[PDB]
């Protein structure tokens, strides 16, 4: 004979998705980290011996939920900033006079008094101006003007991706896989539970992962289906590859007041010589890094000639490497970093030509556009390349070789490299089991 | 000698007023995608021996639904191109009546350059700046509110919406056959929340609503009072078909950076007045039964119908939203009959199209319905009427029933008549012979 | 030996700030009192003794919460009004047919977007600046957009109660002559503070709470040379004000149905606005203030000067009389000196201002529409916001000047007898109790 007995506070859980709130280390930040609740100074991490749980990062809701949250943050930050609606005016632009990617645009902008106009000479990057009449010239309309209104990014706020800890509410937990070499999906043996994720820097990058988490002791390749050519392939590096970026153009910012008390920032003049922006990366490190990736890529799908090409072709935002450091938005051509072949057998830097874009659409949205104000002085940016976003275009049966093209055209993939170790679980404190007991009456 | 015991989870309630959330089974003005998906199985519990009292007039959920509908209408219009720039001098000429070929110049994306356009605006949406003088017309409601265009994608389709109360509350449903609106419902049933209610907006005639069970029923808080609306519900629907013959070719232009504006560019074929059809035999018989039942509440006086009261178009005409366009039909052809105790074929109702509207009668907001391309046809069912007796005089044998009401709440009151929200009181007390041991 | 025990409901509390919500007396008011929850018809003035809890108005967070809350209500009640963006147009002005009024003319958009109407309105010189050296420009046009205050809502301060959520109580200090930072006895407890009027004033408290039977001086550091010194009067010194100009308001339709108001003409001669106060009461009040001030510090030689200098906002009085805003020069109320030994009305000249930023915010500007006809507003002076200017060591005297430049001090003088605490009724204590099994 047996009787059912209920247990409260039982240590069991179930897969689930829920609303998540941040937590930042202790106003003028794009992610509103100051308004975010302060993080817990004690990282309460509890290990789970003998616990084996399966993780499916490609089917979770954390990245999908974080994607919407980040978009709402980017926008809630641009909401109170100056609206450059009056900037959509015909711009008479001419070749910059002091390599051909900057144009000297002269336009009539509104002034505080609605019945007066000010002529202002600004220098805009060609990538942000489109010819009004293709046949003629000296008539360039601001890009994104025929799709949505432009919204100036506030200059006092910073776009730096400081770490943010995504934490669950009370009664919920976030598991943390710690098995070394754990790929995208699998049964994690070294499972552990923490109050919430570590500092996840919300870096906005495309075609490459910057300042992200590194591997433990070996290269890790994660994907929901490696054989599927249409699926994204994320590679995590064990040894970071430092990349240095710089904008030699010593732009001189100038300010003008448009409308009632709304300032507009632009590039007045370039002091000294004008030189294109670029990024330096040690050839030995990158060349040696791909040697390991090619060696590891040859493991999942067998020994075949690994080849890397220069993107798949298309628009700048999806065929070039994006940046968000130094208050600027670079668009680097990574053709030099994926121009090598690797067989079974097998000063000193690689220069990446980069173009700067002011009017941008980071979330691939056509209903909203943002104008990044220029930053005075020669901006420098150094970061660590810790992950790569690869895609195999082997639509035709690969016989001896297949080309790997970096990209993905999706923003959710980059953040997946930082949340692959987690999975939200709803703890069920109630449990029932048979027992040899009967309550009194 | 009797002690007292306290009960928990007792089955009782009390009339209350609480916030109600919506529910539906992105592309609609009601924004039901954000609502909680309704449970497919309707949880209905029948109550035996219950004769709960009902009163739809003092019911508060009708006001809440009216307020929420206003919020969704404004929330849906909030992220849309603001036609504020259309407050320019309009030069219009007769079409090559109810339509005018208006011409003017408007701001293009680049503020520096303008663009000349030729749009066809209905006379109801255009008023003359110069009294009497020709030309120089301006867009109506430009002197009272900012015109806002409806995002072309979001459709005005009145899909069903379920009004559900949070936990701890309940909505009582009256199942009595032919309920008279107010009284003690002898057939009550508890449901977690109301059924799918179509929020179709209309006045002077209820469409696509619920039909009666077995006979026509009349509802009124005070039927003898002239100032109180008389909501009538039919048992058999009277199909009504409408159509605006104009092919209505639509044209689009970009005003300001990114915002687009749609308008009627040209009309292919002959221009014809919009109208609605109703079978004469069916409608004529409906008035017979309506007058037959109306004689029960009043004496044996003869019942006659008039052609509304007269005045503004928004209240004195049957206004319905179908096929993405708003019509304003002259219902004078329906209410033009007299009845006594003794006792090819379609009645045509002239209608006028209108783009600039103030659906909720608010002067602070204005709606601009974009023209729908191609001819549009609409087929709906008439399930109720809004009547108001003009008995301001001491009539002895006559009883004039003029369609009207003018209150938008009346539309939803005709459907929410069988619902009443009550807060659950799970705590009760009663005497009992017991002693709490130490 | 003894065993621990736990008691639920214990009458204890802990100092901790919490979110506060309003409560008004039971839509058309700037403070949105009707939209606010109603106040308790009978507040519980529960008596307590032997508590001797300490208070500190310069450290509590409730005063700061009110400052941010009041600003929110101002924006909440101001954003639905018409935005006067088209008013930022070049103004052509000439002297009124009197140096403080300028007969300005300009183009203003009518109901149509392509039609402008030439209007004639009178703008005070304080809200006008040259665009070059006749064309004049509206002030604050280069700082923020102007917004009109809807006449449907009045600026008259009405009492509003600030109540805590369930589980948090607001203590009420009632010690006689409560100076501030220290120990307070007779501390009563109520669900929430009484009705407090959110009056907007500068360097002089109006319609505030008076002292029980003696003047009170308070400050976070009375000995500091840069800390505000609030003073609470024992009896109120009534002050009268008036605008002799008989203004005639004219309205014009602008934009998509938006309305606008302005000064059309003046009936009769133009005379500068001013405020009166009985010299006998003011002299007696300041005479007694020196007596109470002599006990704190100084070489028994009190000196009063006419402010310390700066812009109009911090160097002059502020009012919100019947919708209009005044700015009076207080040089006449602080032009006296005294020692240990020791018609009939003092007048204060004032200048009317329409464009204002009462909250010292440069991101938003409010345009108060002119109220038609002459308007008067009698008020009671209940406190003073003074600060010592002892830049040199206290040898024989010290100078006291009105000011502060901080709007929080206006509320600190009213919320001085309140402190929010968190009720933590779950407590433990040794006992001989035993848990049966």
């Amino acid at each position, epitope marked *: 004979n047996l009787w059912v007995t209920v247990y409260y506070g039982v240590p069991v859980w179930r897969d689930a998705d829920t609303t998540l709130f941040c937590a930042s280390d202790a106003k003028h930040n794009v992610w509103a980290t100051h308004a975010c609740v302060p993080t817990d100074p004690n990282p309460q991490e509890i290990h789970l011996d003998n616990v084996t749980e399966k993780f499916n990062m490609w089917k979770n809701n954390m990245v999908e939920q974080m994607h919407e949250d980040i978009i709402s943050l980017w926008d809630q930050s641009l909401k109170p900033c100056v609206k450059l609606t009056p900037l959509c005016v015909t711009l008479h632009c001419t070749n910059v006079t002091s390599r051909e990617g900057l144009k000297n645009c002269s336009f009539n902008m509104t002034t505080e008094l609605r019945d007066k106009r000010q002529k202002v000479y600004s220098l805009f990057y060609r990538l942000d101006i489109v010819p009004i009449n293709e046949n003629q010239g000296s008539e360039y309309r601001l890009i994104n003007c025929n799709t949505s209104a432009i919204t100036q990014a506030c200059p006092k706020v910073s776009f730096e991706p400081i770490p943010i800890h995504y934490c669950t509410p009370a009664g919920f937990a976030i598991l943390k896989c710690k098995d070394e070499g754990f790929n995208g999906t699998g049964l994690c043996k070294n499972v552990s539970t923490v109050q919430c994720t570590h500092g996840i820097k919300p870096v906005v990058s495309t075609q490459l992962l910057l300042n992200g988490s590194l591997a433990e002791k070996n290269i890790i390749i994660r994907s929901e289906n490696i054989t599927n050519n249409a699926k994204i392939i994320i590679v995590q590096l064990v040894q970071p590859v430092t990349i240095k970026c710089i904008r030699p153009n010593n732009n001189t910012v100038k300010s003008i007041r448009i409308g009632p008390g709304q300032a507009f920032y632009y590039t007045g003049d370039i002091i000294g010589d004008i030189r294109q922006a670029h990024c330096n990366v040690t050839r030995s490190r990158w060349n040696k890094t791909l040697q390991e990736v090619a060696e590891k890529l040859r493991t999942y799908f067998g020994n075949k000639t690994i080849i890397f090409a220069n993107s798949s072709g298309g628009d700048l935002e999806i065929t070039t490497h994006s940046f968000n450091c130094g208050g600027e938005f670079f668009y680097c051509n990574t053709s030099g970093l994926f121009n090598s072949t690797w067989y079974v057998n097998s000063n000193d830097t690689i220069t990446l030509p980069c173009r700067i874009k002011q009017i941008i659409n980071m979330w691939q949205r056509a209903g909203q556009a943002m104008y990044a104000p220029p930053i005075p002085g020669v901006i420098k940016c150094e970061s660590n390349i810790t992950g790569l976003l690869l895609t195999r275009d082997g639509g035709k049966d690969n016989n001896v070789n297949e080309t790997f093209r970096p990209g993905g055209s999706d923003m959710r993939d980059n953040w997946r490299s930082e949340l692959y170790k987690y999975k939200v679980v709803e703890i069920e404190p109630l449990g029932v089991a048979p027992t040899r007991c009967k309550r009194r009456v | 000698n009797l002690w007292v015991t306290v009960y928990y989870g007792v089955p009782v309630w009390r009339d209350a007023d609480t916030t109600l959330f919506c529910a539906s089974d992105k592309h609609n003005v009601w924004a039901t995608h954000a609502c909680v998906p309704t449970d497919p199985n309707p949880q209905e519990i029948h109550l035996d021996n219950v004769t709960e009292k009902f009163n739809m007039w003092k019911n508060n959920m009708v006001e809440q639904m009216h307020e929420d509908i206003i919020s969704l209408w404004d929330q849906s219009l909030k992220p849309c191109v603001k036609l504020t720039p259309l407050c320019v001098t309009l030069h219009c000429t007769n079409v090559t009546e109810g339509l005018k070929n208006c011409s003017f*110049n408007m701001t293009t994306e680049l*503020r520096d350059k303008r663009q*000349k356009v030729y749009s066809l605006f209905y006379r109801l949406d255009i008023v003359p700046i110069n009294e009497n003088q020709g030309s120089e017309y301006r867009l109506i409601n430009c002197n009272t509110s900012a015109i806002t265009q409806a995002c072309p994608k979001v459709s005005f389709e009145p899909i069903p919406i379920h009004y559900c109360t949070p936990a701890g509350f309940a909505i009582l449903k009256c199942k009595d056959e032919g309920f008279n609106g107010t009284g003690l419902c002898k057939n009550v049933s508890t449901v977690q929340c109301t059924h799918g209610i179509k929020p179709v907006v209309s006045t002077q005639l209820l469409l696509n609503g619920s039909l009666a069970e077995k006979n026509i029923i009349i509802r009124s808080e005070n039927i003898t009072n002239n100032a109180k609306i008389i909501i009538v519900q039919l048992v058999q629907p009277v199909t009504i078909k409408c159509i605006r013959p104009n092919n209505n070719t639509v044209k689009s232009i970009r005003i300001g950076p990114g915002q687009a504006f749609y308008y009627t560019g040209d009309i292919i074929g002959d221009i014809r007045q919009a109208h609605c059809n109703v079978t004469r035999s069916r409608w004529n018989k409906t008035l017979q039964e309506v007058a037959e039942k109306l004689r029960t509440y009043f004496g044996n006086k003869t019942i006659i119908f008039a052609n509304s009261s007269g005045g503004d178009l928004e209240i004195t005409t049957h206004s319905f939203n179908c096929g993405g366009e708003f019509f304003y039909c002259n219902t004078s052809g329906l209410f033009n009959s007299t009845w006594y105790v003794n006792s090819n074929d379609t009645i045509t109702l002239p209608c006028r199209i209108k783009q600039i509207i103030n659906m909720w009668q608010r002067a602070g907001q204005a709606m601009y319905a974009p023209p729908i391309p191609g001819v549009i046809k609409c087929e709906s069912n008439i399930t109720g009427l809004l009547l108001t007796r003009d008995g301001g005089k001491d009539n002895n044998v006559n009883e004039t029933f003029r369609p009207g009401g003018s209150d938008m709440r009346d539309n939803w009151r005709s459907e929410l008549y069988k619902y009443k929200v009550v807060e659950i009181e799970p705590l009760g007390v009663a005497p009992t012979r017991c002693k709490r041991r130490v | 030996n003894l065993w621990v025990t736990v008691y639920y409901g214990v009458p204890v509390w802990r100092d901790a700030d919490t979110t506060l919500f309003c409560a008004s007396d039971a839509k058309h008011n700037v403070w949105a009192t009707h939209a606010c929850v109603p106040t308790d018809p009978n507040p519980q003035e529960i008596h307590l003794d032997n508590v001797t809890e300490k208070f500190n108005m310069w450290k509590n967070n409730m005063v700061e919460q009110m400052h941010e809350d009041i600003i929110s209500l101002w924006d909440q009640s101001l954003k639905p009004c018409v935005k006067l963006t088209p008013l930022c147009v070049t103004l052509h002005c000439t002297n009124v047919t009197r140096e403080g009024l300028k007969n300005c003319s300009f183009n203003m958009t009518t109901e149509l977007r392509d039609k402008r109407q030439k209007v004639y309105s009178l703008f005070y010189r304080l809200d006008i600046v040259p665009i070059n050296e006749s064309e004049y420009r509206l002030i604050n046009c280069n700082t923020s957009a102007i917004t009109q205050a809807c006449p449907k809502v009045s600026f008259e301060p009405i009492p509003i109660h600030y109540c805590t959520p369930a589980g948090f109580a607001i203590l009420k200090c009632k010690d006689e002559g409560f100076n501030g930072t220290g120990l307070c006895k007779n501390v009563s407890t109520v669900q929430c503070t009484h009705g407090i009027k959110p009056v907007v004033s500068t360097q002089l408290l109006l319609n505030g709470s008076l002292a029980e039977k003696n003047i009170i001086i308070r400050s976070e550091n009375i000995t500091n040379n840069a800390k505000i010194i609030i003073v609470q009067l024992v009896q109120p010194v009534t002050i009268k004000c008036i605008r002799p100009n008989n203004n005639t308001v004219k309205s014009i339709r602008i934009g998509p149905g938006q309305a606008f108001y302005y000064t059309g003409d003046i009936i009769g001669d133009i005379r500068q606005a001013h405020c009166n106060v009985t010299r006998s009461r003011w002299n007696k009040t300041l005479q007694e203030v020196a007596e109470k001030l002599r006990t704190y510090f100084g070489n028994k030689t009190i000196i009063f000067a006419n402010s310390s200098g700066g812009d109009l906002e911090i160097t002059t009085h502020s009012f919100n009389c019947g919708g209009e805003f005044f700015y009076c020069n207080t040089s006449g109320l602080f032009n006296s000196t005294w020692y240990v030994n020791s018609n009939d009305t003092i007048t204060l000249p004032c200048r009317i201002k329409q464009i204002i930023n009462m909250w010292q915010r440069a991101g938003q500007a409010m345009y108060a529409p002119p109220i038609p006809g002459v308007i008067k507003c009698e008020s009671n002076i209940t406190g003073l916001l003074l600060t010592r200017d002892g830049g040199k060591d206290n040898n024989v005297n010290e100078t006291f000047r009105p000011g502060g430049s901080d709007m929080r001090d206006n509320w600190r003088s009213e919320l001085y007898k309140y402190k929010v605490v968190e009720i933590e009724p779950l407590g433990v204590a040794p006992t001989r109790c035993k848990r049966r099994v």
Partner: antibody, heavy 133, light 107 residues
Framework: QVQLRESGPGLVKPSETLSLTCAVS?????????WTWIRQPPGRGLEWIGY????????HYNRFLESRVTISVDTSKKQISLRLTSVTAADTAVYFC?????????????????????????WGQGVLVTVSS | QSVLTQPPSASEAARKSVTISCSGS????????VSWYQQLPETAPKLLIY???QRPSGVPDRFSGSKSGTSASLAISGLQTEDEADYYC???????????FGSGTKL
């Protein structure tokens, strides 16, 4: 300084379309100006025909001639064209291609407003147009 | 056709201050600029006064303009022999949606 110069057939038969052009020099054709066409019959008063905004890029014509004239401009070679359909003997006149400045009147959040064609700064040399068998 | 009106001819000797008048209605004269023009024989015209009384570059102070309600006039003084030409007044007509000129006053 801006130079205008007409060019077209001096003699045209009745009932067909009259096509003539006027070159532009010294200023870009797409500049902030109103390229207006004017005509003056022999010893009669001066009357307006239509204009083509260089910046707005749209034409406008007189209501009495709106159903007969169509103005077009070629930005490639900087020249405006006047095409008067169904010419008659009453249309004999010296056509002048004058420019009017699209001066800025006052701005607005949704767009700027400008003056209409008035106070022509420059006029063309003038082309004599006769119509008869 | 010319909606405005002015005397067909005001010819007379020189050395005085003749003043040619131009009138219209609220549609054209009483609503915008009242620019004037001069037309020498067998040649295109030229601008003399734009807006209301503002003079262009190259024209001497001899020529002046004025506006008064729905009327107008061109003021000149110290005339010479080269002034023998046809003068035209102009304004933008709101009702006609097009600028119109006067009948032409021959001096």
């Amino acid at each position: 300084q801006v130079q205008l110069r007409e060019s077209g057939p001096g003699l045209v038969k009745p009932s067909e379309t009259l096509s003539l052009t006027c070159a532009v020099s010294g200023a870009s054709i797409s500049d902030e100006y109103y390229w207006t066409w004017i005509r003056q019959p022999p010893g009669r008063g001066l009357e307006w025909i239509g204009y083509f905004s260089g910046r707005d890029g749209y034409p406008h014509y007189n209501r009495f001639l709106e159903s007969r004239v169509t103005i077009s401009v070629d930005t490639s070679k900087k020249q405006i064209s006047l095409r008067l359909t169904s010419v008659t003997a009453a249309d004999t006149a010296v056509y002048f291609c004058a420019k009017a400045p699209r001066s800025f009147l006052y701005g607005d959040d949704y767009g700027d407003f400008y003056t209409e064609s008035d106070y022509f700064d420059s006029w063309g040399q003038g082309v004599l147009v006769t119509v008869s068998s | 056709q010319s909606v405005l009106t002015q005397p067909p001819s005001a010819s007379e000797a020189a050395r005085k201050s003749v003043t040619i008048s131009c009138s219209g209605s609220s549609s054209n004269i009483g609503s915008n600029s009242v620019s004037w023009y001069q037309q020498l024989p067998e040649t295109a015209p030229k601008l003399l006064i734009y807006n209301n009384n503002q003079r262009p570059s190259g024209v001497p102070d001899r020529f002046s303009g004025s506006k008064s309600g729905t009327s107008a006039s061109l003021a000149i003084s110290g005339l010479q022999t080269e002034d023998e030409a046809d003068y035209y007044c102009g304004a933008w007509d709101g009702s006609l949606r097009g600028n119109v000129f006067g009948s032409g006053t021959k001096l």
